[PDB]
Write a protein that binds this ligand. Structure first.
Ligand SMILES: *[C@H](CC(=O)Nc1cccnc1)C(=O)NNC(=O)CCc1ccccc1C(=O)N[C@H](C)Cc1cccc2ccccc12
Ligand SMILES: *[C@H](CC(=O)Nc1cccnc1)C(=O)NNC(=O)CCc1ccccc1C(=O)N[C@H](C)Cc1cccc2ccccc12
Lengths: 308, 308
């Protein structure tokens, strides 16, 4: 009933242990975490041999730093953070196109594009732990960042993610009230709305800021075809996201964008950024072009302020 | 290739005609309408024997009154209005509980409750044609009203309707800008919105004004559980509509309500109104109780104004 397993508590040294398939990991080790999860209540699985679990021998006052350093009220948070940081360190982050991409491993797509896109944005987080990493990530010590990206998103190493939904969780912890967007929709009746923070910088429906500024079609109204348009946006960038579609990107049209090529929950994120000429990144790789044409789910535009 | 069919152009006199199954109704009669529809492009169906079609021998300047009298830019509108008014007259509207219900015929449910509920509301339409009928409907000459209710909703005699979706089309033509509602939703980010007219008096989500005023749970936020609540409502009544659910009605709690007992698009609307004691109407019928307990999709509350 034994499987060989590596146990680190410091992520510096490792230890080799044996574990009973008959007992919960907690019974034998205490609180235990593997690849971003909380296996502390789980019996051992035979696929788990040859893996490195992060064990955290419990503590009642580590919550000093917890809500402080990490801005979370999850007892599990650090156990998930660290057991991912083990793996995350094993990835290779090379600086490419000036930014810092992630050699594909354990399904990095979303994390690459998320990280490829969070350099280029004017954003400062309200949890110190992110600040450090972001800047370790710009220089190249990004393993701390992807680990927190996982833990904030509640994701596991190797679990596919949607780039859009991931940032929702990172943007909850950043400079929010500083930002403002206003929109009005109109047939019979009419409706104007203002959103603060993350709400204000994220849109689901079109990839074109211009259309949002021009015209964009919305339901109920009374029947089915109102128009909604942007009235005011007070924020440093904008994210425009739609179900993946074919789209046109030109230099200076857009900050950056990322290209999803697959089915609903099975696809491939590829990040494009606009510099000298368009620069497309896929893991370590890169293609640079003066035209694009592909399938995009997300486009990025820098912006100062706009009033209608 | 002949079926016997009755042709009125004045809805006073009838004529008996024969029609070729080989030709479109227009080829033989001109523009032709049956039971609220525009059969003028359709070949005859053999079920159509023994029916009374409304024929409108075309006209280019009847649009004088059209957008005027009826507030529509449908050439078909009057042809649909009148061919329904034929049938609608054949129904029996008895005044019950003080209001005026509709003896069940051709699936009246929604029209009964809609009509049972549009007496009790403080609303004045912006098309004269409705004004007349509404008041013919309060006295009992309601056939003109249900006919327009059909034509405004684009429904046919005998086609089941959702009470909620029907009023959307009648409320497009009523006192709108006079009314105002404001709502704010809040996790990370926050969002406040104002709606004008019909938008402002109709809600989909709960049956309880009180909850809307108390608390009501809404998605995205960042994750999935914001709270939205009512800030200001400036209007004469309120409609609260939800997918049909079990609900509690007490006298003086609510203006009126209607009870849907069936599957999604196959069910039964039953209207309840609060007077001396609760008064439930089903076609001509009526039960009056001091308690209720049933399945409701729509509840009505009179209101003057409210500020948070
Ligand atoms: C990595 C994929 C990968 O590893 N590719 C390989 C590289 C090298 C070698 N082999 C393979 C990855 O992270 N993929 N992410 C992923 O699948 C996430 C999809 C997902 C997950 C959760 C929620 C939503 C989604 C999602 O649908 N995302 C796409 C971009 C949005 C989308 C797609 C299709 C239809 C649709 C409709 C409406 C809204 C979005 C939408
Ligand atoms: C009449 C039914 C009838 O004739 N009953 C009889 C009387 C005497 C003798 N025999 C029979 C009628 O008009 N029924 N209306 C109807 O079926 C309309 C349903 C409908 C139609 C179009 C769009 C929506 C709907 C609808 O679903 N309405 C219900 C009230 C809302 C509902 C119901 C179930 C689930 C659900 C979920 C979400 C939102 C609404 C919702």
């Amino acid at each position: 009933k034994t499987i060989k397993v590596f146990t680190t508590v410091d992520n510096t040294n490792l230890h080799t242990q044996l574990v009973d398939m008959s007992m919960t990991y907690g019974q034998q080790f205490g609180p235990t975490y593997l690849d971003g999860a909380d296996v502390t209540k789980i019996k051992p699985h035979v696929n788990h041999e040859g893996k490195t679990f992060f064990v955290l021998p419990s503590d009642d006052t580590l919550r000093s730093e917890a809500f402080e350093y990490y801005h979370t009220l999850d007892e599990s948070f650090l156990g998930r953070y660290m057991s991912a940081l083990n793996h995350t360190k094993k990835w290779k982050f090379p600086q490419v196109g000036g930014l810092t991409s992630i050699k594909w491993a354990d399904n990095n797509c979303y994390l690459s594009s998320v990280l490829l896109a969070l350099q280029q944005l004017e954003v400062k987080f309200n949890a110190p732990a992110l600040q450090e990493a972001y800047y370790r990530a710009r220089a190249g010590d990004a393993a701390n960042f992807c680990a927190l990206i996982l833990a904030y998103s509640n994701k596991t190493v190797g679990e596919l993610g949607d780039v859009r939904e991931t940032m929702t969780h990172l943007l909850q912890h950043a400079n929010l009230e500083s930002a403002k967007r206003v929109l009005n929709v109109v047939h019979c009746g009419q409706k104007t709305t203002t959103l603060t923070g993350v709400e204000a910088v994220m849109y689901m429906g079109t990839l074109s800021y211009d259309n949002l500024k021009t015209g964009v079609s919305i339901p109920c109204v009374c029947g089915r075809d109102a128009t909604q348009y942007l009235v005011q946006q007070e924020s440093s960038f904008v994210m425009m996201s739609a179900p993946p579609a074919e789209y046109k990107l030109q230099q200076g049209t857009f900050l950056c964008a990322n290209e999803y090529t697959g089915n609903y929950q099975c696809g491939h994120y590829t990040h494009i950024t606009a510099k000298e000429t368009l620069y497309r990144i896929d893991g370590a790789h890169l293609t640079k072009m003066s035209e694009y044409k592909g399938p995009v789910t997300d486009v990025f535009y820098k912006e100062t302020s706009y009033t209608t």
